Structures are given as structure tokens and as C-alpha cells.
Amino acid sequence: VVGGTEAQRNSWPSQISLQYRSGSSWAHTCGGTLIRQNWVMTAAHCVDRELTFRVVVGEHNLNQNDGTEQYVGVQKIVVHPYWNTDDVAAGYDIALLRLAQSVTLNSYVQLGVLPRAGTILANNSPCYITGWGLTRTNGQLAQTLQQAYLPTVDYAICSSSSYWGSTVKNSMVCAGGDGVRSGCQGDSGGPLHCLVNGQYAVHGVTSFVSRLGCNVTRKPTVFTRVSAYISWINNVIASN
Ligand SMILES: [Ca+2]
CATH class of the missing domain: 2.40.10.10 (Trypsin-like serine proteases)
Structure with a gap:
């Protein structure tokens, strides 16, 4: 921004950080919105690459312990079937991520x-x-x-x-x-x-x-x- x-x-509290594994660490790549305890809405283009993804809910500072984070693997990725990565202008830039676990809701983590x-x-x-x-x-x-x-x-x-x-x-x-x-x-x-x-x-x-x-x-x-x-x-x- x-x-x-x-x-x-x-x-x-519905904002999430979508991260990919890079070496022995994790790198933020995209945002998302928590829409169920086990589902995140994000952009299709965010998951074009064949990476290992995780979601962080309760995240504020990418670089410091907030004391509120929950880190959860992405178990399944469902991209809109009409998405085409070389035609973003066509639309359909949306994907759903099913999380490996259901996150716990609190003032930092809401749908x-x-x-x-x-x-x-x-x-x-x-x-x-x-x-x-x-x-x-x-x-x-x-x-x-x-x-x-x-x-x-x-x-x-x-x-x-x-x-x-x-x-x-x-x-x-x-x-x-x-x-x-x-x-x-x-x-x-x-x-x-x-x-x-x-x-x-x-x-x-x-x-x-x-x-x-x-x-x-x-x-x-x-x-x-x-x-x-x-x-x-x-x-x-x-x-x-
Ligand atoms: Ca943090």
C-alpha cells in the first residue's frame, strides 16, 4: 500500500498474509480474506506459481512476533476455472484456499x-x-x-x-x-x-x-x- x-x-481481523516457503524461511507474497475458519479468499494470480503456501492469521508485523499469529498450511487450492494468468484483464482473478486446520477466532482473527x-x-x-x-x-x-x-x-x-x-x-x-x-x-x-x-x-x-x-x-x-x-x-x- x-x-x-x-x-x-x-x-x-479477516486480513491474512499468504506466504510461500523459501529456503528455511517463509516470504509474504499476497493478501487474503478469511471467509470460513478453514477457507481463505485470495486472487488466482497469487497462486499461479507451484509453491508451498501457508496462511498467517492474526498477523500484524511480518517481521516481529505479534503474539497473536496462527500459522496454517494450505491444503487445497481452488482457482476460478475461467482464470487465465496471461489475461488478467479478462477477470476471474479469484481463488479459494482450504486450510489444513480450522483457525480459532478472536479479536485478531474473524471471518x-x-x-x-x-x-x-x-x-x-x-x-x-x-x-x-x-x-x-x-x-x-x-x-x-x-x-x-x-x-x-x-x-x-x-x-x-x-x-x-x-x-x-x-x-x-x-x-x-x-x-x-x-x-x-x-x-x-x-x-x-x-x-x-x-x-x-x-x-x-x-x-x-x-x-x-x-x-x-x-x-x-x-x-x-x-x-x-x-x-x-x-x-x-x-x-x-
Ligand atoms: Ca508477526
């Missing part, structure tokens, strides 16, 4: 609430992106979980020529684009939390930013629209 602030440790199917946010709706992604274009991962206020940019504006044009689909949510705040590499897969009727829900799964840079004016961060995938999510969980 470029232009973020450090999240309070109990603000976003993310998803929107009702079909819900589309009005332009300029209030949301926060969260994650440990780079803090500057071509920078480094955050140590502490970051949040940034990224209002939505509706489909009509986001798909206009000076924004994303044809690259954005109605199955996506755009947010931000102010040239200051954005997602960045390592935020992928994590939530866009939007406040509606007094409650935050996870309306987005972070999918992509401009190839030119993270915080580029009129290139809002682009998310998979969770509310387009409610049936898909429910079907996967019911069949697994």
Missing part, C-alpha cells in the same frame, strides 16, 4: 463479511485497502499492516479512456486513482473493505495496478468484485 497508514491491530450478490457501490464510496504490499512503486513490503482510503471509481468512469478503458470489466471494482494512495505489489489477493449501512464488507480482492506504477493518477487499483462471485464461492465451499 502506497500512501497508507499503519492499521490498528484489531481493525481488519470477513461478503456483500450480497450483485451489489455495486455508488461512485466515490468509502473503502480501505489493506495489506503488506510495497509502500512505494518499486519499493519494499511494509513490515506492519497498512491501510489506505481508496474511494470507489464506478465502471462508467473507470472504463473511460483516460482511466482503464476496456481493461476494466463490470466484474471488477476500481478504487483510488488519486496519484498518492494505492495498492502495490504484495497487496494482491487481499481485501478492499467498504463501509455500507454502517458495516464494512469485503467488496474487492486486489487484482492489478498499472504496469507504469502503483500510485498513478487515473489508474485506480483494480479488484475482483466479490459480489459477482458469491454463488461461485458458495459452490466451491459446498463441494469441498
Whole structure:
């Protein structure tokens, strides 16, 4: 997250860190959202590589003992069947991870609430992106979980020529684009939390930013629209 602030440790208890094994250690690669005690929602592109993955819930600082973490292996990966890694613009950037164990819920570890199917946010709706992604274009991962206020940019504006044009689909949510705040590499897969009727829900799964840079004016961060995938999510969980 470029232009973020450090999240309070109990603000976003559904955020997870998706990590891969690298040598004798683990490296953060993506975010995700805990949606069942044994299921995480993330981006398909986060699991393109044939890596050993684990999830950390209750994570705040990637580099220090928080005293709240639960570390759990990924047991099964279900990528959306229409995902194509060389066509992120097509959409379908979503995957579910079944965890090896069911995590224990507490103020640091909660299920993310998803929107009702079909819900589309009005332009300029209030949301926060969260994650440990780079803090500057071509920078480094955050140590502490970051949040940034990224209002939505509706489909009509986001798909206009000076924004994303044809690259954005109605199955996506755009947010931000102010040239200051954005997602960045390592935020992928994590939530866009939007406040509606007094409650935050996870309306987005972070999918992509401009190839030119993270915080580029009129290139809002682009998310998979969770509310387009409610049936898909429910079907996967019911069949697994
Ligand atoms: Ca930690």
C-alpha cells in the first residue's frame, strides 16, 4: 500500500498474509480474506506459481512476533476455472484456499463479511485497502499492516479512456486513482473493505495496478468484485 497508514491491530481481523516457503524461511507474497475458519479468499494470480503456501492469521508485523499469529498450511487450492494468468484483464482473478486446520477466532482473527450478490457501490464510496504490499512503486513490503482510503471509481468512469478503458470489466471494482494512495505489489489477493449501512464488507480482492506504477493518477487499483462471485464461492465451499 502506497500512501497508507499503519492499521490498528484489531481493525481488519479477516486480513491474512499468504506466504510461500523459501529456503528455511517463509516470504509474504499476497493478501487474503478469511471467509470460513478453514477457507481463505485470495486472487488466482497469487497462486499461479507451484509453491508451498501457508496462511498467517492474526498477523500484524511480518517481521516481529505479534503474539497473536496462527500459522496454517494450505491444503487445497481452488482457482476460478475461467482464470487465465496471461489475461488478467479478462477477470476471474479469484481463488479459494482450504486450510489444513480450522483457525480459532478472536479479536485478531474473524471471518470477513461478503456483500450480497450483485451489489455495486455508488461512485466515490468509502473503502480501505489493506495489506503488506510495497509502500512505494518499486519499493519494499511494509513490515506492519497498512491501510489506505481508496474511494470507489464506478465502471462508467473507470472504463473511460483516460482511466482503464476496456481493461476494466463490470466484474471488477476500481478504487483510488488519486496519484498518492494505492495498492502495490504484495497487496494482491487481499481485501478492499467498504463501509455500507454502517458495516464494512469485503467488496474487492486486489487484482492489478498499472504496469507504469502503483500510485498513478487515473489508474485506480483494480479488484475482483466479490459480489459477482458469491454463488461461485458458495459452490466451491459446498463441494469441498
Ligand atoms: Ca508477526
